[PDB]
Design a protein around this ligand. Structure first.
Ligand SMILES: Nc1cc(Cl)c(S(N)(=O)=O)cc1S(N)(=O)=O
Lengths: 133, 133
């Protein structure tokens, strides 16, 4: 169970940059972002080998404690036992997740959140640096 | 209230770096480090002009809700309307706080925490970057 942070006060268009170490035995890691632990506009879950998925990013939302429908992504620029940085911005319509090696995707902001105040990391990812601008 | 982070798992000898923006009319700011809001190995409180103090760093501990004996440090290398970084490490005997302009001081480690797991920021300091290394 990894870093939990609150009172982030991230506003639309502002960049949240997260750099960490992907464990050498990595199977899965998670970054959760939202209003609080029950209201997530982004559950970001790269699965190296987990829950039947191989090298697939799965995203979801959580609204008032209820998980939404999982969305699978098309790119996977992560390797076990490496450093990786993710950069996230949002607006009320979409989150934009920028990944290593120039990859990126958008995920709809199902909560239409105008501020992100909560982040939590879990799984095979050791955070080394968080930046807010 | 500003950023609150938990599960930091900062081990002895590891460096926590915190960079932020000091408000142009700053009066004071606080970084609290420890186990939780009731158990702080370091309450670090630069006062530009607050509580009768001028350009003085006030430090203390808090153990089971009880404030310890305050200490006041010798140097004040902070300026309103600037960017400032602090860097903190600890061993069993002391926390070492490294300040802008190369200044550093030690504060006794009065608690027996195996790791620093909690940070909370308050006051006239906007955190821009936190690094765990
Ligand atoms: N400023 C703004 C304008 C529009 Cl139009 C939209 S929307 N409705 O296309 O998502 C969102 C925003 S923001 N930056 O608050 O998320």
């Amino acid at each position: 169970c990894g870093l939990v942070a609150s009172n982030l006060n991230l506003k639309p268009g502002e960049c949240l940059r997260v750099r960490g170490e992907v464990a050498p035995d990595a199977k899965s890691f998670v970054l959760n972002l939202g209003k609080d632990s029950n209201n997530l506009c982004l559950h970001f879950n790269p699965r190296f080998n987990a829950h039947g998925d191989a090298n697939t990013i799965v995203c979801n939302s959580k609204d008032g404690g209820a998980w939404g429908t999982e969305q699978r992504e098309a790119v996977f620029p992560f390797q076990p036992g490496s450093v990786a940085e993710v950069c996230i911005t949002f607006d009320q319509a979409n989150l934009t997740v920028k990944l290593p090696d120039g990859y990126e995707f958008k995920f709809p902001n199902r909560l239409n959140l105008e501020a992100i105040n909560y982040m939590a990391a879990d799984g095979d990812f050791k955070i080394k640096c968080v930046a807010f601008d």
